[PDB]
Amino acid sequence: RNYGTGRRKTSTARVFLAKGTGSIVVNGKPLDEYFSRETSRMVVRQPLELLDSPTAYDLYITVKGGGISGQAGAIRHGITRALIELDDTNKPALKAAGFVTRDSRQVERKKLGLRKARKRPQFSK
Amino acid sequence: QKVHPIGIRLGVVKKHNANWYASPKQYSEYLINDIQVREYLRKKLDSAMISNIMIERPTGAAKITIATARPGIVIGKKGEDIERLQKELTKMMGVPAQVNIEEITSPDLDARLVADGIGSQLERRVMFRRAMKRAVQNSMRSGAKGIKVELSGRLGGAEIARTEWYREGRVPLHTLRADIDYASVRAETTYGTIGVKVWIFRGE
Amino acid sequence: PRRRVVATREILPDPKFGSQTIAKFINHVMSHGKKSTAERIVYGALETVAQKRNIEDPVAFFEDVLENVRPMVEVKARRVGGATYQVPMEVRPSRRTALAMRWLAEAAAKRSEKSMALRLAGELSDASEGKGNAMKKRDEVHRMADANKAFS
Amino acid sequence: PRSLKKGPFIDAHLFAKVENALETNSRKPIKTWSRRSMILPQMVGLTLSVHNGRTHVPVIVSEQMVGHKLGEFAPTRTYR
Amino acid sequence: RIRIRLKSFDHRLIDQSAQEIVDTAKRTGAQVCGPVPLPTRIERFNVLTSPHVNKDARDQYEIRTHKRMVDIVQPTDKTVDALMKLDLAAGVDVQIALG
Amino acid sequence: MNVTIRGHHITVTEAMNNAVHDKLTKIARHFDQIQSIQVILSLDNSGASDGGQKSHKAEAIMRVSGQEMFVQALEDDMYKAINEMADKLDRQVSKYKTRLERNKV
Amino acid sequence: ARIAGVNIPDNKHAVISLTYIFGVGRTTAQKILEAVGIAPTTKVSQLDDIQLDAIRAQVANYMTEGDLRREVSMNIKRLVDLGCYRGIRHRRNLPVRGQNTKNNARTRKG
Amino acid sequence: AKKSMINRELKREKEVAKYADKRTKLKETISDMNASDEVRMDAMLELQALPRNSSPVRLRNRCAITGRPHGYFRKFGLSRNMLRERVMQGDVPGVRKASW
RNA sequence: UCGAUGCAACGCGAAGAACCUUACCUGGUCUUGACAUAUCUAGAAUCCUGCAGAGAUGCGGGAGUGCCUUCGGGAAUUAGAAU
RNA sequence: CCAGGGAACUCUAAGGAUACUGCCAGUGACAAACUGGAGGAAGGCGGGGACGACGUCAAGUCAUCAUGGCCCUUACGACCAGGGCUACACACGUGCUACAAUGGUAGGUACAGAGGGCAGCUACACAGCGAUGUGAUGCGAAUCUCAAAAAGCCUAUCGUAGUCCGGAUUGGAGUCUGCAACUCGACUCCAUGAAGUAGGAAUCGCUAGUAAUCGCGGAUCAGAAUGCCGCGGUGAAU
C-alpha cells in the first residue's frame, strides 16, 4: 500500500502500489483504455520497466487536472515516488533517468503589451 | 517614471487608510462616499495640519481616524469644533460616524505636513531653495534617517520651468521594507503651480 | 550567443521502436505541436517501406538511409577584408543528422503521392538507394564544397 | 430587423399625423423627422417629407414601399 | 449548529477574526470544527497609467476576497451567548446562518 | 521606391507636395537603391516662449535595403524646414552610398 | 445525369452532385434525397431512371436556377427602380449590408 | 467632463428613477401571455409613448469625481485616471498591485 | 469632432459612436442660465392630468399643507428681481 | 476529498522549512571567482512578475483632473430632434480567416485551468432545422450555473479538384437587445459561392513549457470583439 503523489503541469496523480500481477487502474479504467496516445502510454510504464519489473505490482492511479501527456507525466512521477517509498535503494537507479525530479515547467503567463508570454506584435520596417 | 512609494508598499510594510469590506454592489457606493468624505474634510481642515486620515468603517457606523499636529484647533474648546464637523460628517455620510483625533508626535517626520509647509511658504512668496533647505534641515535633525524634497515648476516665476531636488540621508526608494513616507502637494503661486514632493525615510 | 555552451534538451524516445533518432525525426515532421499526428505519419511511412522492402528492422533501415544521406563537408560564409568567399569546413556530427532529417522532410514535402505518409515512404525508399531530392540537395552541397576546395 | 411578435414600430406623432391625413386624403406633404417609423399599408399613396439630417426630402409612398423604414428613401450622405 | 462565514480583503485580519471566533467557543466549553479556508475570489484590473496614450503602459491591480467558515459541534447556551457580544466588524463581514 | 508625404497639425498644400517631391527625386537620381520615403510635415509647437524659430518641423524616415536613416529639421518656416531636411537626407544618402561603395575594395 | 436542365457530375455522391444546381445547397440536397428514398452516399451513376425521375420531380418544389435567377434579379431590380438606399448601393456597386466602404470592399469594387 | 454633461446625466437618471416602477409593471404586462392581445399592444404603445430619457439605455455611467465617460469600472465607480491615483494613495481598500 | 505622428503615432485615448455617449453638422429654442453663494416675495416638497409640437418647451385644471421651534421663524423646495 | 462514515490522500488557504557556493575535487594572486560532482523537488540569478537611477527627447497629455495668461458672455455658454464620427478612385499600419489530405465532413469516445453569475447564471420539460420562446428549478455561490473545452483518439467518406477547400458578397425568411436595428447591431436558417492554389523587393517575432497551434473566460457592456487583459491543452527546431 505504498502511495505516492506525482505532479506535472496541472495534473496531480495519486498512485497506490501493491505487490501483485500488474493490473494498472488509471482513474477506474485500464491504462490502454484511458490513454489513447501511445506517447502517454509509455510514460506510465517507464519507471516500472526501467528497473525490470513491469508485471510485479498492482497500481491504483487517480489522476485529476491537466491534459493527456501532463497526466501521464504526473502518473510517472507518482509511481516513482511510490517506488522509492517501497525501497530506498530504488532511488539511486531511478534518479539517473530524472523520474523523481518534479518538472516545475509551467505555462508562462501572458504579459502585458505582448500577444503571448514572449510573442511581440510586429512592426514593419 | 517612478511608482508611488506607498502604493508599491501597501501590502509589504504598510497599511491602507481604508479598512471596510463591501459587496461588489456596495463597493462603488462606499468608495464614492469615502472619497467625498476625504475631499470635503481635507478642504475643511486646510488651516489645521492634518496628515493621513484612515476612514475605516464597520457595518452601519464608521470610525474616521484623523491624525494631526493641531489637536486643539481641530477639536475646539471642550469638543465644540469636533462635534460641529461630526454633524456634517453624519449628514453627508451614512449612519452616524465617530471621528477620533490622533496626535503626530514629530510633525517633521510626516511627509504630508512638511510638504504642505513648503507649499504654504511658496504661496507666501518665500525663496524656493530657502524653503527646501529649511525643510531638509528640520527633518534631518528631527531623527529622520533621510529626506528628499523636490520642487517642480516656474520656481520664482521663471518662464522656463525646472525641477530642483534636495536629498540628505538614505531614502532608499527601491527597497520595499523602507518605511518611506511620501507626499505630493501643490503650491498655488501667482505664476502657476509648484509641485512639492517629499520623501522621508525612517527605518525598516 | 556570445556566452556559454547552453545544454541541449533531452529527447524522449518514440514508443514503437524506442529510438531517439525516430523521435527526432518525428519532431522534425511535427508542426503546430501535433506530435501524435507526426507519429502517425512517420509510423505509416516506416511501415510502408518495411512492408514493401520486406525488411524486419525499420529502425535499422532508417539508420542506414540517414547515414547515407547526411553530408560530410559543407560551405560557410567567411569574411576577410570585406570579402565573401565560401570556406569548405567539416559539418559537426550533431548538425549532420539534423541537416539530413530536414532534407528528408523537405524533400518528401514536395512529392506527388496522396498522403504525407506515402510521400515520406517514397522519399525514404529513394534515399536508401541514393536517389530523390534529398540526395540531389546533398550532392549539390558537396558540389559547392568540392568546387571551392581552395579556401582551407 | 424586429421581432414579429412585437409588430411594426410606428412613431406615435407620425401615426397621428397620417391617421388624420387619411380621413381627408390630402396631398400636402407630412413633414416628419421620424425616419425610423414603419411604412404601413394605411399610408400608401400620400406624401411625407422625411428629414435627411439637413433638409426634408419628399417621399410619395407607393405600393412597393410597405415593408421598409421611412429613412430608406432619404439618403443622408451626399457623395458625387 | 450555528455557522459563521467570514469575508474580508485582508488575509491576516480574517485569520485573526476567525481565531477569536474559534477561541470564544473553544474557551466557553464547546467543540468547534476548525476554520476551513474557502477559495478566494481574486479579481484583477488593467488600469492604463498614462492620461492619453501608451496602452502598453498599464497598472495591474488585484483585490482579493478571502473567506473562512467555522461550524460549532454543539451550541451550548454559555458558548452561544457570546457571539452577538463579540463585536468584530470594520474589516471583516460575519454571516451567522444559525441553522 | 515609395514616397509618402503626411502632414501633422498642418494642411499640406500642392506647393508643399512639389517642394518635397522635387528634392526627393533629386536624391533618388543619385541613389537608385532607396526602398521607401516617409516625410511628415508638422507644426510641433506655437513658439509661446521663444517666438517660433522651431515652430514647424519636417522629418524624413527613409528605408534602404538593410538600413533605415531618419532626419529631422525644426525651423520657423516650413519651406526652410523642408530644405534643411532635404539637405540632411541628401548628405546621409551620400554617406551611406560611399560607405557601401568603399566596402568592396 | 441531367436535373433541372444542367448536367450534374455523376462520378460523385448524389448529395454532393445535387449542389451543382443553382438553388440547391447541401441541406437542400439532403432533404431532397431523404424525401424519396435515396441514400446520400450513392453515386449519380448508379441511380436508376425511376429514381432519376423521382429526384427530378422532387427538385421542382424548390425554386431553382430557372425561377431563382429571375426572382433574385427581380428582387434587386425592385430596389434599383425604387431608389431606396439598398437600391442605390446596388446601382453603384458598393456594399449594402453595412460593411466597410473605406478599405475592405474589394469583393464588390473589383 | 463638462458641468453641462454632468447635470445632463443627473437629469437623465432622474427620469429613470421616476419611471422605474411603471416600466417594471408595464414590461410584465406586455410579456404576460395571459393578457389580451389588444391589452399588451396598448401597453406597448404606452411604453413607446413614455418620455425618451426614462429608458435606462440612454444612461452612460461615468466617473463620480471627473465625469469621465470612458475607462469606467463598475466595482469602484471611478474612471481609470482617478482610480489609479486613489489606489496608489491606498484609499481603495483591499486593492493593491498585481504580480503573479 | 478632437487628440496621438521615426523607433517610442497608426486594434493608440476609445475597457466597446443606432439614440445617449458626442465634443461635429442642419434646424428648432433659453439667457444669472443645466450647475454654486449673496437676496426678498408665496408655497411642504411631491404626485396625477389635458391639449400643441419632432422634442426642447408653451398654455391650462385637481389632491396634499411638511417637521422642529411656535408667532423672528430654520437644514430642502418650485416659478424671478437684479447686480 | 474517498485509502480503509472516515480525518488517510488530493484540494483549498494562512503560518513556516529548504538553497546558503552549505559539502567534495580541481583551476585561480595563499583572493574574488570559475569548472565539474554528490545529496536534494529545486544549484549557483531555480522559472516568471512588480520594482524603471541622474538625466534625454521644449517627447505626450490644458480633452480625465488641477492650473498662469489670453479669449467668448441673447454666446465659443445651454436644451432638444434628425444626421455624422460607419463616407470611398486610393495608400499605409496592425490583425483575423483561408488557399487544404499533417486536411474538409458525419458518427461516436476522452483529458483542463482560470474567471463570471440579482445591472444575473440558469438544472429540467415542452415548441422550434436553428438563433431562441414559454413554464419551472437551484444558486449571492468549493453548494446551483455559465459549460459543452477544442486540438486529440476510432470508423466511414472525400482522392488533388478552385474541389465535399475556402466562406467574401448578395437575395429571401427570422430571433433577441433596446423608445427605436434605414443610415448603422449581433446572431439563426435557406440560397449564391468571390478572390485565394502559399505570395516581388523588402521586412518581423521567438532561446523552453518558449515559438507554433487549440480551445475557454473577463473588463467595457441593454445589445455590439477578429481588439485588449487573462487561462489552461498539445508542444518543437536551433
Side-chain angles (χ1 to χ4, degrees), chain E:
Chain E
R1 172 241 357 134
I2 58 88
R3 239 242 255 294
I4 315 114
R5 283 180 214 112
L6 306 130
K7 281 173 66 155
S8 103
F9 303 139
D10 243 77
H11 68 91
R12 172 226 327 152
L13 184 65
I14 206 76
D15 206 295
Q16 125 188 18
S17 166
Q19 187 55 293
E20 149 173 283
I21 282 182
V22 165
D23 270 353
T24 182
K26 250 174 56 49
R27 295 159 44 65
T28 49
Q31 196 39 281
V32 159
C33 33
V36 310
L38 297 184
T40 37
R41 166 174 196 209
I42 305 172
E43 29 173 329
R44 325 250 187 96
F45 301 86
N46 274 125
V47 192
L48 38 65
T49 74
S50 178
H52 188 31
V53 275
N54 323 119
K55 212 186 157 161
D56 312 357
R58 239 72 106 89
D59 250 340
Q60 275 167 328
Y61 301 141
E62 46 149 46
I63 163 167
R64 283 199 187 61
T65 300
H66 312 264
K67 194 216 177 147
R68 305 263 180 292
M69 152 293 279
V70 277
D71 316 6
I72 53 86
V73 183
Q74 71 311 306
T76 86
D77 264 299
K78 60 149 21 216
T79 281
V80 61
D81 55 41
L83 295 325
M84 59 318 284
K85 356 266 258 57
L86 256 78
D87 285 284
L88 182 35
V92 166
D93 159 53
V94 278
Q95 309 294 56
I96 325 162
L98 184 125

Side-chain angles (χ1 to χ4, degrees), chain H residues 3-17 59 62 64:
Chain H
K3 200 100 147 195
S4 47
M5 323 273 192
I6 303 148
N7 307 337
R8 173 188 314 164
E9 169 194 44
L10 259 296
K11 69 106 168 182
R12 185 154 296 144
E13 201 191 272
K14 200 84 198 55
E15 288 191 357
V16 172
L59 281 200
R62 43 217 326 171

Side-chain angles (χ1 to χ4, degrees), chain F residues 1-101:
Chain F
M1 174 231 62
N2 287 79
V3 164
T4 294
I5 300 170
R6 288 196 244 251
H8 187 198
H9 277 301
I10 192 167
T11 89
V12 160
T13 38
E14 323 197 10
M16 263 161 246
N17 240 24
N18 266 18
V20 185
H21 272 123
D22 272 302
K23 321 212 95 213
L24 284 185
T25 327
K26 272 219 161 151
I27 318 159
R29 217 191 275 109
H30 299 349
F31 203 37
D32 288 273
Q33 301 286 318
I34 324 218
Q35 293 281 321
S36 84
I37 292 272
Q38 322 147 230
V39 171
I40 293 174
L41 309 183
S42 208
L43 180 75
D44 62 288
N45 52 84
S46 44
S49 150
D50 89 314
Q53 272 169 282
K54 303 199 136 213
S55 76
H56 296 75
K57 198 187 168 164
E59 61 184 2
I61 318 107
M62 91 146 51
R63 315 217 157 95
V64 86
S65 182
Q67 276 231 27
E68 43 196 293
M69 50 199 99
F70 158 91
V71 305
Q72 40 158 44
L74 289 288
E75 185 46 33
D76 200 45
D77 235 332
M78 178 71 81
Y79 286 99
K80 331 215 270 166
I82 285 177
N83 277 266
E84 288 190 31
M85 173 207 93
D87 272 16
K88 295 166 145 193
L89 202 53
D90 188 340
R91 201 273 165 81
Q92 280 224 264
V93 156
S94 182
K95 186 137 86 150
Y96 175 85
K97 183 193 158 283
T98 22
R99 305 193 56 141
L100 267 229
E101 286 166 9

Side-chain angles (χ1 to χ4, degrees), chain C residues 37-66:
Chain C
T37 279
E39 267 175 27
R40 186 208 343 300
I41 306 82
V42 154
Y43 288 155
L46 222 70
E47 199 262 8
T48 285
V49 305
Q51 184 275 329
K52 188 93 63 65
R53 257 143 163 279
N54 278 286
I55 167 65
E56 310 86 15
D57 220 2
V59 86
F61 160 78
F62 176 55
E63 290 289 353
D64 171 35
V65 24
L66 208 35

Side-chain angles (χ1 to χ4, degrees), chain G residues 2 7 9 11 16 18 25 29-30 32 34 39 44 46 53-54 62 79 81 86 90 97 103 105:
Chain G
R2 158 186 254 277
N7 323 298
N11 35 293
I16 286 313
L18 275 203
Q30 284 270 21
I32 281 175
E34 300 328 310
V44 164
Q46 302 196 85
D53 174 46
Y62 299 106
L79 297 145
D81 66 55
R86 321 182 36 206
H90 271 295
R97 319 252 82 192
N103 290 308

Side-chain angles (χ1 to χ4, degrees), chain B residues 1 30-31 37 44 55 59 85 87 101 105 114 164 175-177 182 186 190 196:
Chain B
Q1 216 188 356
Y30 275 8
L31 184 62
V37 170
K44 159 142 281 166
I55 318 199
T59 186
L85 165 141
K87 266 38 92 173
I101 307 302
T105 26
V114 182
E164 303 259 332
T175 296
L176 266 7
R177 70 197 227 235
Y182 169 81
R186 42 164 53 204
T190 163
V196 188

